[PDB]
Amino acid sequence: MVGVTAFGNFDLASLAIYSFWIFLAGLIYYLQTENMREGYPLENEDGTPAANQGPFPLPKPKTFILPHGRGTLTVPGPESEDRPIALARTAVSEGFPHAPTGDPMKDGVGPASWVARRDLPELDGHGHNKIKPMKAAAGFYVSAGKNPIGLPVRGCDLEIAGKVVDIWVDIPEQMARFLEVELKDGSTRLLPMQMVKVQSNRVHVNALSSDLFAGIPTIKSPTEVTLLEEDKICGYVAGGLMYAAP
Amino acid sequence: MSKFYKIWMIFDPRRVFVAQGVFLFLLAVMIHLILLSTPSYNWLEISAAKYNRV
Amino acid sequence: MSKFYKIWMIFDPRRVFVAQGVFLFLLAVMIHLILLSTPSYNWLEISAAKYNRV
Amino acid sequence: MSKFYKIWMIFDPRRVFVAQGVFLFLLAVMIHLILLSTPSYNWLEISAAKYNRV
Amino acid sequence: MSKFYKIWMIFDPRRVFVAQGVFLFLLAVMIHLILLSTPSYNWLEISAAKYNRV
Amino acid sequence: MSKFYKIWMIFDPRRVFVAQGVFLFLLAVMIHLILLSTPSYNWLEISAAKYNRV
Amino acid sequence: MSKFYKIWMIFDPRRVFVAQGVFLFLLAVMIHLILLSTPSYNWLE
Amino acid sequence: MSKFYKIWMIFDPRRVFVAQGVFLFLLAVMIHLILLSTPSYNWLEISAAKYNRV
Amino acid sequence: MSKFYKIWMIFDPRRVFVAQGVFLFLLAVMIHLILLSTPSYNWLEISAAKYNRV
Amino acid sequence: KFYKIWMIFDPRRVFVAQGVFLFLLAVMIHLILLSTPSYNWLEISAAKYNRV
Amino acid sequence: IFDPRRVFVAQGVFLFLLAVMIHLILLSTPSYNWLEISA
Amino acid sequence: DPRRVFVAQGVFLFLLAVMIHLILLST
Amino acid sequence: AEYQNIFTQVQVRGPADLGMTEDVNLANRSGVGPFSTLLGWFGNAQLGPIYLGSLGVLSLFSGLMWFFTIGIWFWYQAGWNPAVFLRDLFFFSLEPPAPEYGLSFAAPLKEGGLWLIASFFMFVAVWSWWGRTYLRAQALGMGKHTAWAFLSAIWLWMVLGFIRPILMGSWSEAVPYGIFSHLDWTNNFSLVHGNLFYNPFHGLSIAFLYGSALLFAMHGATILAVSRFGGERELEQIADRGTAAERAALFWRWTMGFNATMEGIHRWAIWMAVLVTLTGGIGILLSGTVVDNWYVWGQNHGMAPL
Amino acid sequence: TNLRLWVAFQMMKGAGWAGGVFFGTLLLIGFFRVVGRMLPIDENPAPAPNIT
Amino acid sequence: ALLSFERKYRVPGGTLVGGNLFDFWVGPFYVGFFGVATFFFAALGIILIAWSAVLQGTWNPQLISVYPPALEYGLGGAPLAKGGLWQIITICATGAFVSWALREVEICRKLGIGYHIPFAFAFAILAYLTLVLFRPVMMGAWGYAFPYGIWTHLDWVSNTGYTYGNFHYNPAHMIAITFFFTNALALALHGALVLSAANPEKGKEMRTPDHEDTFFRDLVGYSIGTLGIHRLGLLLSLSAVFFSALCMIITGTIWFDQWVDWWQWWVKLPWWANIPGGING
Amino acid sequence: DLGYTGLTDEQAQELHSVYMSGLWLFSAVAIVAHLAVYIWRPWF
Amino acid sequence: LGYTGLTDEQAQELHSVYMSGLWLFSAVAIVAHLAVYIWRPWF
Amino acid sequence: SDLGYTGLTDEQAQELHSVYMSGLWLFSAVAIVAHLAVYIWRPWF
Amino acid sequence: GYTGLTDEQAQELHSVYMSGLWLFSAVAIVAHLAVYIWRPWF
Amino acid sequence: LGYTGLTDEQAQELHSVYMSGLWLFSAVAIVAHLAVYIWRPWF
Amino acid sequence: LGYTGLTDEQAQELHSVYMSGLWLFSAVAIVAHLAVYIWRPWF
Amino acid sequence: LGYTGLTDEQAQELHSVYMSGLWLFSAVAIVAHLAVYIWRPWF
Amino acid sequence: LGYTGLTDEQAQELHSVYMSGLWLFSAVAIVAHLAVYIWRPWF
Amino acid sequence: LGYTGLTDEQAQELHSVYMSGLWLFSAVAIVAHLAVYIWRPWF
Amino acid sequence: ELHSVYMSGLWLFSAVAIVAHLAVYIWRPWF
Ligand SMILES: COC(C)(C)C/C=C/C(C)=C/C=C/C(C)=C/C=C/C(C)=C/C=C/C=C(C)/C=C/C=C(\C)CC/C=C(\C)CCC=C(C)C
Ligand SMILES: COC(C)(C)C/C=C/C(C)=C/C=C/C(C)=C/C=C/C(C)=C/C=C/C=C(C)/C=C/C=C(\C)CC/C=C(\C)CCC=C(C)C
Ligand SMILES: CCCCCCCCCCCCO[C@@H]1O[C@H](CO)[C@@H](O[C@H]2O[C@H](CO)[C@@H](O)[C@H](O)[C@H]2O)[C@H](O)[C@H]1O
Ligand SMILES: [Fe+3]
């Protein structure tokens, strides 16, 4: 056994524990700076850079090569909200909420917020659209659980907003993503599968009421949904939890 | 020894200075603590014995 | 020496002062704590012994 | 000296005041606790023995 | 001190009063708790000893 | 040895120097610590014995 | 002193009363527990 | 053994040189440590015994 | 037995040489370890006794 | 007519699977011999040659 | 019925494992320890 | 499925026969 | 009362996914197995295909020999009686050779010789699997993060069974092959080395093991909370940051005062987990070789009253 | 007089909720105490885990 | 100092108590009704630990220990310096943890996400309450709870564990450990798989989730999927904590002897209890 | 003036007067309770 | 300057009420300390 | 950009610093008096 | 065709493999014969 | 050369105030050390 | 032809160079064994 | 080369100020070691 | 062949320099072993 | 060769500066080892 | 053709195995 101290009580076990503290501080610094590649530098409520930016500097930029000729992502880099934000600050001082000036679900602010993502479908490994309707997918079927096709769709106001026509599936991952819901007007809307409850004889949507399924953002192509449209649909539906429960 | 200034064309000056500043402080603290832990060089205890304080 | 001002063209002044303030206070607390550890320089116990407060 | 006011062109007064408020209170509590920790300066125990309240 | 009123043009009163109320209750509870911990100022047990309630 | 300079075509100087500096300091600290552990070469203990400081 | 009423122009009166009711009840419970713990003032025993 | 140069037409010079450096250093440290563990080859204790420094 | 070269068209040489290098080094280290374990073939212990060093 | 075993089985798999088996078997046998004092050639030579 | 590639590999490992088990069984029995019977 | 029968029959016959001799081996 | 995305509501099955053929030898990859509906309520239903190359055969055979060697010794300890085999299944053990033999290989098979043979097979199986982990990522062009995270777990495994017994000078310092037996080795190790609770690296190892459960609960619950925005698709949130990544970041920023990114959270994840065995390996290696009484060592370093 | 009812109602609403949470804990603590008495505890006491 | 994308999410509402009285931020931190409560309980708890240090007579953070009242006090109150400060800190800790979970609920409602995170944190709170509140009340004394010290609360773990022999033989303990070890394995695999896809070999395109499925099907023959792994990680962490609280709530209250003796029920099963040979026969 | 909640100057005076009337009444009931406890068992 | 939207008159008005509350709080504390000091002086 | 990170102008920083220093001198003056009373009551030197 | 090899490639692989098998067999027989002379096990 | 966007005359201005605060801090620390050394020398 | 995209002549050269290294490694090992066996035979 | 984007003019001026700091740090350390060696030599 | 990008000429230049370093590393290690064996032989 | 982008003149220049540092470091270490071996030799 | 070459190994395995059991039977019979 070594057990011998170089000085004081500083033995080999003391060297190891202090060495780890230095490594741990270096590791934490690395982890924190690697996690500052999105949303930095900090801003004020007006959009100008904040005076305070924190003890950790921004990391050196890294480049991502997108898998299907979709370009290159450099982070941290220039950042901007391309859409306008329909909010008005409730106070001159920082740290207070910004009230919606209109209909937040329509505007897309607060819990209804959406990100101006790339207006292209997510592609699988082979280059095809990752999400497509089941009747357009070949060889796809409901394998287990209640088949939610033909079931009426009920909102949080206990009224029927339509019926389910199709299921949008994730082809590489083989999972139901969206439910295509036909309204009384005859148009179809998409509802994320995580925001519906597939009951025995109905599909219940807790987030939206009957007179809000019309406001769901539509898809520009009946057999294709883009990342921008998924974000708008998922944001709008989840915004109902706050703005559709009077 | 006259071309040593080219190291700043290789390494980020900010990262070198931060790494060096941390290194020099921790090295200095380590040596001071080593001297404090040796009774022959603990200047706080050497003066205590010299002036008969404890 | 005459060009030491050019460090502020290298390092962000906002982070330097915050780091310096944290460093200076922690260093001062460390040295104050070390002196309290030694009985010969623990001024709270030196005065107690001097004035017979035990 | 007469240009120390320019620190407010570098640091935001709102964040410094909160930081200074937290620092000053924690420091004051820390010293009061240190004095209460030393038997020779625990003013609650000192008055107890002085007035024979044990 | 004739213009300490300008603190209210730096800090919004709504967040200040909430912070102050938390701070004042925290400090007051802390001191009462400290006094109860000390047998020399625990007013509840001073009374029991004073009136021979044991 | 006349063509050793072509090592820098294969390896990034930035990567080598950081690795070399870490290796050089860790090795030097370890050897200094090994000598301190051995009483035959603990230059702090040898000075104390020589100068009757214990 | 006579202008303490302006606190109701800073804080919502309906939100203060609910929060104040929470504070006063928790304060009373804390003092009762402290009092109920001292043998000289425990009224249950 | 004049065609051994073709090993570099199969393997990356970067990876092999790193793998050789890690291997060479770990081997030398292990052998230096094995000798330090055996008392018959501990050159620090051998020197201490030869000059009677204990 | 003069047609063994066709095994290279079957197995990728890059993985084979790595496979051989790891296999050969582990076998050599394992056998050296077995010799050190056996007291009759621990050449460090044998030389210690022969030359009367411990 | 054993040569047909290559028409069915992949030559990469059989050579490796046999080579893996042969090496593991050889190490196991050498270790069993070292386990048995009657065949530990390192201990046998030590006693025979009057060594440590 | 049976896949020619699946059968032989599964059968082969079975034959080898049974060979070891019987060899090790006699190794365990003191009456069939040829490494010690020859001793 | 004749394949699954052979696997189920082959495993049961082999494991029991191994077990039967092991029971004999135990005593 | 709303859907919690803990189990799937509707299972959808299509053609079996054969996987990406980036640089993978497709002849070594098998076919797709059966679809398990039971697994489909929680994760994917598809089983297989599995790749079995050269390192797959080496790892499968070496580990099978290791598994069979322990099992045959267990049958020997049961007297070849199946009733006793099941009754004392957790009580059987393949002990390492006694300390009197040190590091020698001249130990009888019944008295630790079989432990060395079984340990050799385990050594080959684990390291062969590590190369399999490295080569599977290489054939798909992926990073080697999986292999290096595996190396941290191997480091603790190597220290327990190989590195520390060599440093301690005997195989008897290693872990026996038994269910309850290696739990007794774990308990005896702490008692012998004076309350391993006071090993600083054991305490750090526990801090990261606790933090692994904390971080996976945080990250798992965060992704399920934003899976209504597609948060489960973490790769496309890294390349094209959606509203799921922003809500996930803002929850923790508003809670903790700081947050992660969709990619950087997995750097926190991999490091929190590998530090369990990296720090754990150091602490075990320091026991017996540097410190033999961790509580006494604790007392001389704070950590415990004098 | 109506506004006085409003002020009292809001404070009572705050105090009533604090009562339900506090008394809910007492019902929980009271439950575990009853369960503890019906168990072989107090017949198999444990030593003090702390040095106190 | 907001994030670049943060401003559009700072909207009013989502609170459970009040609604605008405390519905604001202090820097990054959201303040609510429970944000005020969490800060008070936390700040009071820290200062009472600091005050307990001066009563203990130490300033080494590794030696500071707040002990629960001795067994003589039962479930009643204790003097502050004896065991009373532990009780108040426990109440402060309980209030701080519960307020922290409720504060997350309001943050969840404001951002319109699911309530998984506060629910998962509640599992940690109930494990804490099992050791300080539920088990001590069942055993009838506050002194069966662990002290508030960095290394003294490990002494409680050791002393409690060795009261029942080797605590490894607790069957719920074994189940909880398996989940803990598997969770750390799953976290390492999940972090590595995502990073290796996002950070390919060199100068290559970022890998798709199809490659993630392919990697683990090629490795172990199965891939649970992007949604499955996050469900699994959440379940493994909560199941480990659930069985941890279960292994302690039954210890000292239902089981009283050495936990090794419990496993004798398997060996004493009639059909093999009396067969010579093996370990136990 | 500041008006962070929509109450006017006259509405704040009215509500405060109601708030103080119950504050003093609540204080008075607490004084009597303290007197009752003090008579039964003084703590000074 | 001008971080909260309050003008000078509003700042002076609010700070006058705040200080009036502060002195009232301090005055009761001064009486409370005076009563305790007579009952049990700590100096 | 040392011409200002906080948006405060030069004369705004002068006025804020003037009030801040007054608060610092008032805080120090009380601290000095409090230290004098303690030193008279129980000196530490 | 489970391997893509015909007889033209099955016969060649077997011819080399058997030659490698005989060489390994020949050395193992020589190794066993030497061991038996040194220390017979029967 | 610049990484922070400060000009040369801004760096000189910032440094001049910084050094003035450094010398003032060092002036107090020297007086503090001199007083402690007179009270209780450590050499 | 080949499973690794290597021609016969590409395999002809790789084996011949590999074999020359193998005999070089074996020749050194034979000399090493002879030195050990003379110093301390194991048979 | 040029991984940091410094010209040769900027590199040698930065190194000039860095070396001035290095020698000033070394000069204090040389004097500090001289004072300690006179006070209490370690050789 | 051509698994990295080196040609026949570049590999010849690389291997010549690699062997030059290898012989120098070996030549120093031989003198190192010679000095140790003369100082304290292990045979 | 393009692994690092050095054009056989930046590599000759960088090696020249690197070796200058290596010899300066080795020269200092030699004097350190010579001084210690005179003080107390380790052979 | 699978059966034809398989049974060739069976006799190769069994006849050698018969020699194996016969040799041990003479060396140490188990009946
Ligand atoms: C372990 O070691 C121990 C603890 C024992 C000993 C160590 C002790 C140490 C290290 C102590 C360190 C102490 C230090 C560094 C103390 C520093 C104290 C300072 C800097 C205090 C400064 C206080 C300044 C105050 C209180 C200023 C207040 C200002 C106001 C109240 C005015 C308000 C400001 C306004 C209105 C701004 C103007 C606004 C407009 C719109 C013009
Ligand atoms: C256990 O082992 C023990 C501890 C006992 C013994 C071991 C000891 C060991 C391993 C010691 C190792 C010591 C070493 C390696 C020390 C190295 C020290 C160095 C390199 C110190 C260098 C210091 C350099 C300094 C302080 C330079 C400062 C420069 C400035 C302040 C100027 C700032 C530069 C500016 C402003 C450039 C601006 C110019 C432009 C154009 C922007
Ligand atoms: C935080 C990690 C990085 C820090 C910077 C690098 C520092 C490297 C050296 C750190 C080790 C020295 O730290 C110091 O070690 C000595 C060695 O006995 C300890 O020793 C001191 O306390 C112990 C325990 O009471 C006594 O037995 C001993 O007589 C006394 O000198 C000190 O408690 C510690 O403060
Ligand atoms: Fe994830």
Author numbering:
A (entry chain H): 1 to 246
B (entry chain K), C (entry chain I), D (entry chain F), E (entry chain D), F (entry chain O), H (entry chain Q), ...: 1 to 54
G (entry chain A): 1 to 45
J (entry chain V): 3 to 54
K (entry chain Y): 10 to 48
L (entry chain 1): 12 to 38
M (entry chain M): 1 to 306
N (entry chain X): 17 to 68
Reported in the publication:
Rhodobacter sphaeroides is a model organism in bacterial photosynthesis, and its light-harvesting-reaction center (LH1–RC) complex contains both dimeric and monomeric forms. The core light-harvesting (LH1) system of Rba. sphaeroides is characterized by the coexistence of dimeric and monomeric forms corresponding to the S- and C-shaped structures, respectively, observed in native membranes. In addition to PufX, a previously unrecognized integral membrane protein, referred to as protein-U, was identified in the core complex. Protein-U is located opposite PufX on the LH1-ring opening and has a U-shaped conformation.
In order to further explore structure–function relationships of protein-U, we also determined the cryo-EM structure of a monomeric LH1–RC from a protein-U deletion strain of Rba. sphaeroides IL106 (strain ΔU) at 2.63 Å resolution. The ΔU LH1–RC monomer revealed a half-moon-shaped structure containing 11 α- and 10 β-polypeptides. Three αβ-pairs near where protein-U resides in the wild-type LH1–RC monomer as well as the β-polypeptide paring with the 11th α-polypeptide were not identified in the density map. In addition, a group-B spheroidene between the 9th and 10th β-polypeptides was also not observed. By contrast, all other proteins and pigments in the ΔU LH1–RC were present and had the same structures as those in the wild-type monomeric LH1–RC6. This result clearly indicates that protein-U plays a critical role in controlling the number of αβ-subunits in an LH1 monomer and that a structurally complete LH1 ring is a prerequisite for both LH1–RC dimer formation and its subsequent stabilization, in firm agreement with biochemical analyses. Another important finding of our work concerns the role of protein-U. Although protein-U has no inter-monomeric interactions in the Rba. sphaeroides dimeric LH1–RC, it clearly plays a role in regulating LH1-ring size. Because monomeric ΔU LH1–RC complex lacks protein-U and only has a half-LH1 ring, it could not form a stable dimer.
